[PDB]
């Protein structure tokens, strides 16, 4: 026989598809649904946080004078915020692609609550944010960690730490390098200390569920219960607005795509969510 | 018109060519402009809506990439770096313009103080080192109109 | 990334996509062989097509 | 750099140069010789479309006449270096011409500089770019005819 | 780009490799090809283009791209940074490449073996020159897949 | 493989190896194939080729390999390199031949690769036969995956 030679789209002519199938992309896990989400019509919020209260208010058997404290609490303000995100497209590359036109979509769909999930993790009240779960949260004890041979021990013992305090627990909102790392443990040569001893389990441990969120500040693991701790109000729900006049369609023969909504998020106090940063 | 006499590139295009850059009438390049209209500006302005990364076209002429999000230039990299290129009215587009490739400015909106790259449709995305184009490590400012370059 | 919160600023945070292109390719190989040694043989037609197969 | 052994004659200055120096462009485009509506020519160097302006037109041949261009403002230039092997001088009735990049000497007409359209015999002129223009500016005095050194 | 110093599958002087600037772009790992030589060719014509004159695009994807018929540039056209070629089409030896402007050796190929012509099958070929232009510098001496200078 | 498509057809062996006046059974040693007369060509008659594993007889002569179900014969197998052809590698039957290990290229049926047999039937094949023998030692050069001298 004879050696054959490859030249690009060719060999036969039938082709009448180009690109199919929806695609992949790199993503992580959200804690945003778990919360409780309620409508409004104002036009900007004040909230309280918890500072420190006391105890005791000790009887005059003791020969002490009780308590007459009162409990104190610091307001923040939230003023309306937009979140966004946006896809470009060009009406041609979606005609002869074939499903890109449902695909865009889907990822324009995705792409916003991503960029919604990256804010209400990391970054620090500024002005134009709201409430962020990474400020909330309490302080670590260095004090709770202790000697271990496995990332998986330190973990299930951060998440015990919350119920002895009386906090609410329902999630475990964890870095996306500790999580993962906290599965993959070993006992020096292997063995997951955190799954059991012939199945691995990423989805639900100790009967509550794990989020891998990427930003959130390095290697932190929270234990918290999202319903109490923050709520969403939404002045307007999620839509998508296209425009063919805007300031990148009229350069180049483009269609804009714009996925947006308006938010608020109120985080009530600093208690019912624990941080703990792992052994020295 | 014939202003914009002297070496400007702070009063000619629409936006910065450069503020702390320098060329002659020394042509080290006699390409045009077919980036920023006249027929409907000065003679002084060119109407540059970025003087950043280029790609030829056919003939020789220098312009801004008009790309989309899934296209993009390739090679061809010069900055722009003219003052007045060996005129007696001003540079104005279609006119001579003397290039670089190491000069100065490169347009970015972002939100700045990271690299960036040219695909200006309206749309600017960041440098990287592996996927788009190596800038070489720099500060870009926020918004076109005022950009200093490191 | 910030998302911007002026809506009269279009986000310049936006998903980045690239097209790629694969041409089709042909994998082969022919075995000649003479039926009869095969047959006499008697497992050797079966495995020819297998190693043939396991080949390709 | 580019070297030359010809030179081509222009009433006004003299063009004898092809270096563009580093980032600019000395790439040999060869192209056919066409005279278009213009006066026949054998060989020469200063006529209606001889040296100078030009503008590709299809087929990879240079003449002058009107633009091909593909903006409003700015459009094609090439110029004929004349290096005496490979390249018969200024534009002729047939034979092949190697041409370069880089505007050189242009021919103006009545009141030159500045934004320009065309005259349609090749030569561009003043007005104000609508499809039409000019490719650089001189800064000498502009006259009548004559193939004017910028 | 513009001094006489080429031959060579990989030089290591100035305007012969970028890495950063320099008329051209190159990353810091590259991206690869997706048409061309990218991995070893023991055959095949690897699609159009052989000539050099291909855009990196976004993320690792290098892509096509070509001339308009009837039409060359007169401007600095894209070639691949200068690699050898064990493979059959491409430029590179299988190695991942980024794309340049002039200044960089490729391979041409053809049915002549006298001054470069133009081709609108999307490469430029080797034939005789009349009325096709020339290609690089040291124009087209090739014996297929020679080292020729751009 | 080099720009626009590698290797087809024939290639080129080498030419005069003369080999002359050993001891041992070796092919090398100018000598005959033969079937039977008076060998070949007049003056000025140039060789065909053939490639094959031939099997050394009585004698100072070579023939061809057959069956498997007929012993084994001669030393090691060989492939037949030229000396009275001007063409290739290989001879023409019934002149002075040397053989070597390289035959490169004229293609038949299967591979030469890590020694050659002889097959039931008689045609011509590669290693590995026994693993507790040595058999004829032909060792071709790098061509794999692609049909070729044995």
């Known amino acids: ?280 | 018109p014939y202003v914009r006499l002297g070496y400007e590139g702070i009063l000619n295009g629409a936006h910065d060519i450069d503020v702390a850059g320098l060329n002659g009438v020394e042509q080290l390049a006699g390409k045009f402009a077919t980036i920023g209209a006249n027929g409907v500006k000065l003679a002084g302005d060119n109407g540059t809506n970025a003087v950043g990364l280029f790609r030829e076209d056919l003939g020789d002429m220098v312009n801004a990439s008009e790309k989309a999000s899934f296209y993009f230039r390739g090679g061809e990299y010069y900055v722009n770096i003219s003052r007045t290129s060996l005129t007696a009215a001003g540079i104005a587009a279609g006119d001579e313009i003397t290039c670089d490739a190491d000069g100065k400015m490169i347009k970015f909106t972002g939100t700045g103080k990271a690299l960036g790259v040219v695909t200006h449709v309206g749309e600017y995305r960041a440098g990287n080192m592996y996927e788009k184009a190596t800038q070489g490590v720099t500060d870009t400012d926020t918004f076109i109109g005022f950009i200093m370059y490191v």
């Open chain 1, 1 to 280: 026989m004879s050696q054959l030679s490859n030249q690009e789209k060719e060999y036969l002519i039938s082709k009448a598809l180009e690109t199919e199938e929806g695609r992949v992309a790199l993503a992580q896990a959200m804690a945003n649904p778990i919360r409780v989400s309620l409508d409004y019509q104002g036009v900007g919020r004040k909230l309280l946080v918890v500072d420190p209260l006391p105890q005791g208010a000790l009887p005059v058997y003791d020969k002490d004078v009780d308590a007459k404290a009162f409990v104190i609490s610091k307001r923040g303000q939230v003023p309306d915020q937009v979140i966004e995100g946006d896809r470009i497209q060009v009406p041609t590359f979606e005609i002869v692609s074939y499903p890109q036109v449902r695909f865009s979509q889907v990822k324009e769909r995705r792409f916003n609550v991503i960029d919604r999930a990256q804010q209400r993790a990391k970054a620090d009240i500024m002005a134009v944010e709201d409430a962020e779960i990474f400020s909330l949260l309490e302080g670590a004890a260095t004090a709770v960690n202790a000697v271990t041979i496995s990332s998986g021990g330190l973990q299930r013992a951060a998440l015990t730490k919350a119920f002895q305090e009386v906090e609410k627990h329902d999630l475990v909102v964890t870095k996306i390098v500790m999580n993962a790392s906290a599965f993959a443990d070993i006992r020096a040569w292997g063995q997951n200390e955190f799954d059991p001893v012939t199945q691995h389990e990423v989805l639900q441990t100790g009967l509550f569920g794990h989020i891998w969120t990427a930003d959130i500040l390095i290697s932190k693991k929270v234990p918290q219960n999202t319903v109490y701790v923050l709520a969403d109000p939404e002045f307007v729900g999620v839509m998508p607005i296209r425009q063919d006049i805007q300031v990148i369609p009229a350069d180049k023969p483009e269609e804009l795509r714009l996925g947006w909504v308006i938010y608020e998020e109120l985080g009530l106090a600093v208690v019912n969510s624990l941080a703990i940063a792992k052994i020295s």
